[PDB]
Amino acid sequence: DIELTQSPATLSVTPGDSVSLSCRASQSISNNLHWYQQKSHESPRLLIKYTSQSMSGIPSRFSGSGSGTDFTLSINSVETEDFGVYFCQQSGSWPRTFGGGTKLDIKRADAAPTVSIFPPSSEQLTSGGASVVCFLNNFYPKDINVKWKIDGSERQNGVLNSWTDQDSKDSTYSMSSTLTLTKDEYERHNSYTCEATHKTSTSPIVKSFNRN
């Protein structure tokens, strides 16, 4: 099987930067190499066909080049809407294969997360459940670490974390952290704390509440 190796695996680019993505085939595939851009939860979108041929509806900023086993997808003046995963795929040999993809995200000014903490709803409590939800919204860069503290003790069990893809509007990221415990347990403590460790500050953003 012809293996397509893409480089870099990931990269952050500032709007206006020119970009060149690499895709190398283990062996010749001639010009039978195609490029795609895939947004989260969307099928890949064909950008360039047969190494350098254009696809209608694709911004001119995208171009492709290569010959043999070295191929390049170039973006002249990358734009905010260009974030996503770029894949190359060959059709010069069977089976058809795809590169591992290059995750491209937009570099933007640092932004501290907006943290919101929510105690368990009266309804959930009535059902005997207890969930403490914490939202860390619109921050950047993506790297962040949340930690829960119950009456001063870090709780790792029962914590569920989820991150969003990069925002298409402000290029930021967001995260939700849900600390789940039994109602009894929740009722056994007072201080519930959500701590966000982000580079936008030496001291982490901390939001908490007292069961009162």
Binding site: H41, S43, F98, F118, P120, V133, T164
Partner: protein, 213 residues
């Protein structure tokens, strides 16, 4: 004008079988191969193979041999991919694409969840706060449901800006998801903010108004 329509999200038990459909409209169905592609969570694309509608000609490239069979009904312009002897390795998004060397026309994707976990309706909880920060952030906790997916909207879709619906997280055969909505402080509690949760797998539609605590 060309468009491939795939069948919806599927939930099946390991060892079972599933058949995914791909209907093509806009061109002579039997003159193009229909490609099948597999993609797992945040992973790369894997070409499973292809079939030439009307010729039963096929090429199989799936990992474990014999588990994938392609068929096509030229009468209904629909190609099918049947996966048998399902295991967790088969849980993924499967795409259909017309064979043009490159793939320009793709299906929308069909997500297959292989699991013995039982379908369970979601419990929807309002996330009410304590301008709190210029605007005020509200939310809805959607937990204890299975399988994916669930669609969340606010005020029947009237509120989209400032909305963050996080990817669900699986835990003990139950998915938990949450959505936040940041609105100006003047809008709420002044105006009603309601999250609408739908979980087709369990014929569940819930509207949970976010009332001040």
């Amino acid at each position: 004008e060309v468009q491939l329509e795939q069948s919806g999200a599927e939930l099946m038990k390991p060892g079972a079988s599933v058949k995914i459909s791909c209907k093509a409209t806009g061109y002579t169905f039997t003159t193009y191969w229909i490609e099948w592609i597999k993609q797992r969570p945040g992973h790369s694309l894997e070409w499973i193979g292809e079939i030439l509608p009307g010729s039963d000609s096929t090429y199989y490239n799936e990992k474990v041999k014999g588990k994938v069979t392609f068929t096509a009904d030229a009468s209904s312009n629909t190609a099918y991919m049947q996966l048998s002897s399902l295991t967790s390795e088969d849980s993924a998004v499967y795409y259909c694409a017309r064979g043009d060397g490159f793939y320009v026309y793709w299906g929308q994707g069909t997500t297959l969840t292989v699991s013995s976990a039982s379908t369970t309706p979601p419990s929807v909880y309002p996330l009410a706060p304590g301008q709190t920060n210029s605007m005020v952030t509200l939310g809805c906790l959607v937990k204890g449901y299975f399988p994916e997916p669930v669609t969340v909207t606010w005020n029947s879709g009237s509120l989209s800006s400032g909305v963050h619906t996080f990817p669900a997280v699986l835990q003990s055969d139950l998915y938990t998801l949450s959505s936040s909505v940041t609105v100006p402080s003047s809008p709420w509690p002044s105006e009603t903010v309601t999250c609408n949760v739908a979980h087709p797998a369990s014929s569940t539609k819930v509207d949970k108004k976010i009332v001040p605590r």
